[PDB]
Design a protein around this nucleic acid. Sequence first.
RNA 1: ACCCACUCGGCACCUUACGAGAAAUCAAAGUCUUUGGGUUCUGGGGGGAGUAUGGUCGCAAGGCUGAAACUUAAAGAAUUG
RNA 2: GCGGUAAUUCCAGCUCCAAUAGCGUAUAUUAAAGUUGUUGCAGUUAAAAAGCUCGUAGUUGAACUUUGGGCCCGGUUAACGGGGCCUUUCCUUCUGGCUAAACCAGGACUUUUACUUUGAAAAAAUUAGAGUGUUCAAAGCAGGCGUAUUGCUCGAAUAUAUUAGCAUGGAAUAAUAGAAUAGGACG
RNA 3: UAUCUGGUUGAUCCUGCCAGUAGUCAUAUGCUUGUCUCAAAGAUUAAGCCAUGCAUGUCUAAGUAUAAGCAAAUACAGUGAAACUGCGAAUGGCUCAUUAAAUCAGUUAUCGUUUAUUUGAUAGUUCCUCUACAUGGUAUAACUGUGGUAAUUCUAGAGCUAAUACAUGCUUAAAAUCUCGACCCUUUGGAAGAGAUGUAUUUAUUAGAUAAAAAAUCAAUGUCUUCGGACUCUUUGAUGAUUCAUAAUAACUUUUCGAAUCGCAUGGCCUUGUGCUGGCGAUGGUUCAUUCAAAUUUCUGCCCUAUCAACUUUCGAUGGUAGGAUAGUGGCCUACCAUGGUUUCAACGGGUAACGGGGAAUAAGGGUUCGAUUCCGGAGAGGGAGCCUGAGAAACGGCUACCACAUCCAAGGAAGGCAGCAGGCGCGCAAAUUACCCAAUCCUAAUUCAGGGAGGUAGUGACAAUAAAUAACGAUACAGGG
Lengths: 188, 260, 185, 271
Amino acid sequence: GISRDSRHKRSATGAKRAQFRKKRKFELGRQPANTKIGAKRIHSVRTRGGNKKYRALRIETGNFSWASEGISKKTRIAGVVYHPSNNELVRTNTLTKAAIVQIDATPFRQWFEAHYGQTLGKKSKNAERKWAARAASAKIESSVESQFSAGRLYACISSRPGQSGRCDGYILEGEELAFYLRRLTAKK
Amino acid sequence: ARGPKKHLKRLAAPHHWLLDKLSGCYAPRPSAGPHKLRESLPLIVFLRNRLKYALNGREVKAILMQRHVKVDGKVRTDTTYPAGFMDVITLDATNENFRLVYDVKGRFAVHRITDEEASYKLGKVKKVQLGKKGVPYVVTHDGRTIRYPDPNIKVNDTVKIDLASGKITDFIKFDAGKLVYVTGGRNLGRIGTIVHKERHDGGFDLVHIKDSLDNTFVTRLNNVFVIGEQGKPYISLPKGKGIKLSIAEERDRRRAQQGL
Amino acid sequence: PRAPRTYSKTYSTPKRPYESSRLDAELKLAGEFGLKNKKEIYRISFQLSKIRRAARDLLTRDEKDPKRLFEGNALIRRLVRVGVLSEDKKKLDYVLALKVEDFLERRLQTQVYKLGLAKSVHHARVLITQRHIAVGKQIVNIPSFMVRLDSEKHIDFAPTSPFGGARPGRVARRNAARKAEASGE
Amino acid sequence: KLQRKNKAKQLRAQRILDSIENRKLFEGKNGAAKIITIVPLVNDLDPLDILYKLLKCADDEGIMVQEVDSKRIFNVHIKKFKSNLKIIIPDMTNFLNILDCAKVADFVVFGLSGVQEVDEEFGEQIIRALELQGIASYIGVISNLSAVHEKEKFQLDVKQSLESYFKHFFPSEERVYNLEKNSDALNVLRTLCQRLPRSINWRDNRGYVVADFVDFVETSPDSGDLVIEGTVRGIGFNANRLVHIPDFGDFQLNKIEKISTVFESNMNRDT
RNA sequence: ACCCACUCGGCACCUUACGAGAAAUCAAAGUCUUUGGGUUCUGGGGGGAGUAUGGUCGCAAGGCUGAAACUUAAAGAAUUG
RNA sequence: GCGGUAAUUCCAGCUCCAAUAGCGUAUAUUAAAGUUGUUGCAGUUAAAAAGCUCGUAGUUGAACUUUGGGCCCGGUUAACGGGGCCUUUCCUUCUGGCUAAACCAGGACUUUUACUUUGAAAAAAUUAGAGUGUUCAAAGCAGGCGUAUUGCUCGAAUAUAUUAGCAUGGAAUAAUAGAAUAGGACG
RNA sequence: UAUCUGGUUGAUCCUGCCAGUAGUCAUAUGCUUGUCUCAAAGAUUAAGCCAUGCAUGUCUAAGUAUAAGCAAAUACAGUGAAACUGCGAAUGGCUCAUUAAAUCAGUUAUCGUUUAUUUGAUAGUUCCUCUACAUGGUAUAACUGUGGUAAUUCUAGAGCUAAUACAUGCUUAAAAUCUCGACCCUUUGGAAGAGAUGUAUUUAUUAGAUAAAAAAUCAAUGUCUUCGGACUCUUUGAUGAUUCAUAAUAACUUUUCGAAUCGCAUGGCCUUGUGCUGGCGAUGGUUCAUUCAAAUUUCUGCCCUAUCAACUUUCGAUGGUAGGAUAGUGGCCUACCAUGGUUUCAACGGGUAACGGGGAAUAAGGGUUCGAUUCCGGAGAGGGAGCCUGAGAAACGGCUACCACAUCCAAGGAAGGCAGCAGGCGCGCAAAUUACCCAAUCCUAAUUCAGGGAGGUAGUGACAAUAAAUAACGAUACAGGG
């Protein structure tokens, strides 16, 4: 079907090769999986060597990570806002590795309330000592607070959906976040 | 060709098996095991072409299924079990123990060893790593992986496994001045001391070895197996003490032990 | 799939086939030593040329090369063990100096001529063919046996073969039977 | 290269298509009278044993068992080679019956014995007579070679002696088979099933019918009609032409029915 | 301007064979079976044939490049009549 | 009857020669062939020097830079080859001891190459070749010797593989780079 | 180991080609044919077409036994047809059509990957803040019985019953460390009890130091002295090289694994319970290593051709970024953006009656010619393509579809792949038996046992090669050298 061998393309000199053999199996390729947004629907695929690649066809509520506090929460995915490679996947909301998506906010803000105690967008003396020990570290930059006030964050998917099923990622921080806002506001 | 190969024709066997080119058109092809097939000796060849105890395939088969041949203290019932270098295979029914070691000419030779000192086996530790769950382990030339080694044991050294469960006894460091035996190449079967080791980053550090009669040679590090220090190797050497004398004095020795 | 069996032809035809001189020499050799055809002369000349090529390209080798010493000693040793070279000619220029005749002299047919016992060279050939002579103990019927030196003194009549006793042959048996049935009664 | 290959293919197809319309003309398989007659040449020989050896190697015991009881003309259908064999054993006491059976047949098989030599008064005259009267395809075979000493060297000496005898009599064929060995029995069977018979000029230019059902119906008190169900081979018959029946004479045909049309003899009857 | 001697670079010549060559002849056609200073081009018996085809140059005439099937035992230097 | 008979012998026999359980023929190829020529062809007249000159790639390209002398020692049969010292001469990237930047013990050491020596790593069969009486031989890798009553035992070598890649000694031969705006070395 | 001789020849000499000579492990053919050892053989033309038969099955003490099978422990127990299950069927064998930087040869790389098996290591954590574990449940084949079809190794509905089948499912220690904290008692504050802590997956982050020595700072600030404040061993492997091996934290998962299996043995303990505990194995299982391999890969090397000089990029040609896919790198594919890459040192195109190499013939050396073929590597099963199962296939003695042939008939439908072994037709100058056997060499399987046209033996056989019978000795009479 889909071939990966280097024998159907021209050589470095423009020389046209000839068919050395039929299409072998150990160089096969498989059909793409344009994974959409919806309820979870996953098909498994048997691979060379007898392993499995969990092809995710529809997925939501993936894992996402905050690097600075280093936490990870299972969160819904509102949808793709920017894709670096192709533009049509933004229109049809197709997930890939390294994709700029918009996700919901709430598990992060409940963790922040339970962990630091301060509020964004506007008893228990042991927990008071916990907050005092965790004080003088509650400052984050302005744009993440503005997103928390909005209720949706900009994250980047850094996991392969069609190769392992999961749709994992990290929320943007700093220079990455600034560059992606600049590109998003310049294009859109 | 669509899968692994299971047959081995004659005129594709190792030459040190000493297989006759007539009397059949096929060779054993040892199955997977401790050694690669090009450096291995199947039990069928060892028991019908070296000892002449068997006569054919079915007699050595009846030997093996009668549970009399043990490789490394374990009973093996394959005719094509690849017995290789520094194996201590035993025949308990007749009370001899054998050790496989290259002769002076480069072929696997019979070498009778006692009840004692058949209780160990040397092994070139080939690569050391740190396994899963933090445990450190070594693996030698015959696939044996031994956990919790002595920390001074590094890559390309010699350990001394006894028989039972690994349990590495006193080992040998790799440095100049040690008795060294050869397991590959043109100088296959000579013994000697390292006089120097040359280092070449990128590939194949070489070793300069001088034997007991001041005949020096150079070999790649993959064919180097240090067996001890000067004067007292820990194993019993084969006949001729691994010297590789030239043809003229070999013919002189033929004319010396000729007659009576 | 069985390994090929190796073989080699052991004679060679002359390039110039037809001239008077060597034809005269070959017919002379056949007359003196009892030869069936010209294959025997070609065989001895071929093995002699092989020997001389070996002696020659060891002679082009420099002195005290161990290969030259070893192979020269082996070649001289085999050609004195056959008995063609004399004892006092163990040199490479001397092994270059051989002929066809002294190779043909060391054959068994010529030797069973020379030790008595045959009284004619063609009688020697037909009586060596006919299974009458044991070298050592073993009965041999090959005229081109190339007798060595250590087996030179053992050429005797066989334990079979009525020339060495042991139940006289077929024609004598039938003659005795005829004279028994006729002149007996 | 491809133009060369096409030129070769086109010329080869031309050659084959030229060579096809010479051999394709026959039909057999589903229905064919490829008659085999078994002719012994030694009095101490049983042709029923020959037919037993022949039918044993098609793995069909029931046909031979049904042939054991009382029959001499056999319709055996082979499913291995898918061939309709008709086996006829002539009467050895009627030599003219042997001549008629051989002159109607397409295949004849000669049974030869390895113990008793061929009689110069019994079998040799049969061989000469069948040669002279017109002979179709023939196969010679040995049956009693087991009655010879058990060792194969003597038996093959006998086999080559009778091969020499047959090639003095018939040099066109050279190998005489053994029915003790199953292999040559199978070779005989495939030869009988597959190989096309040659033609005998006199019998195939006037037609011949081998009959199975010949019964009588009443037409007149002085003469009536016999009913011959039969296989027609050769040239075919005409309603007006006369027909000869051996040991009966010449008669006029009256009616023809074709089962696989109705033909009645008109005023053009030969008197 | 002429004469004598010398020298460089030429166009040519007479003799010779130290050498070369099949011979006529050659100060090069010498330093070559004792065969190697550097480097371009061309030829492989005679016909078919400088034909046929292709390409290219040319307004034309024509030029440059250029085979094969087939066939055949043949096709320079002197002396002597 | 003789002789001649583009009878290119028109047909048969006798004798002789060569090879011989084999011999001839056809085709293809190799050698003798120096008619493919690198070793090793030829070009005045026998085939063959462009009509002539310039010129790109290609091939080829003047000479010159550590010579010579003395010292010892040991290797091989008075000769041959070797290594260190001195003679303005051991020139480079770094550790540990003697010290007052310089000695000793140590890993490497081509400005970039070509060349050449030694070595590694180089499948078996085949090739050359050592041994061994398959009865000889082509072969095969066997075998040989004994109280032949519980046996002993040699051996299954060696050599080659011109290329490309790897390591190593040499520095003749043939190349390249270095300080002319000193933008240079050495502390 | 290095010889020549005739044709132009009329009287001569050289150039020149032809003819003669010899060899071929080089094919055929003509004639003849006694012996011994040895053995190539439908490659050239047609990788053309195939009747018939064999060529792949497999059970040990160790998965399933109610055969109304054969024989001889009241659950079974000997042997064992059938069938489910597991493994193999991807090795062999054949052929040389394609293939001209493709295969191949030697040499490397995988710090860029897959790997059934063999061998060595390797799993106290599972439901759980109300539970079968001295053992959960469903079906189905084989079988009984009824049938359809002309046919095929075609099968339907009906009734039974098992697993190492399919589907679920708890055991197990103690310690330690973290998050949440009833809090209390008032502080330099310190505390009951709740949860979590195997492996595998995916993501984010952190540790994975190390060329030799001297002070002042603050913050996180820990133990101890003598609360002045002092402070010490502190722990890190390999490689030439790593974001390596590995560890730790936060989570995630249609939660992968963590023994509901089988044989042979009756050991030990006493509370004497049909209690506790216990051997020798076979079979499975996660991860890593080893081994059999596999796939991509660096360097250098090919036959003839200029009557092939420019070629590659619509429709990827060269590179960059990111993505998809793959076992994995990679224009292998897609989006975007650059305008590149090869070439007289002959690119690209064409021819090959071209598989490549180890090798073979020819012996002065150098070379010329051949290699379809006993070994190694590649490709293919009439031409293409796609694919299921599986560790491994783009398999063809597997399937599907089209194409070209072509078979059976009840005219409705079904079955096909000899470039495997024999053999047949055809093509030809050109090539053997429809034989015997697993005894040797070895392969496959549940495995000493069965199977193997792999292979061996024999038949045909003047391919080629070795050894040497067809006569030997007298006497007589002559002829001699005498």
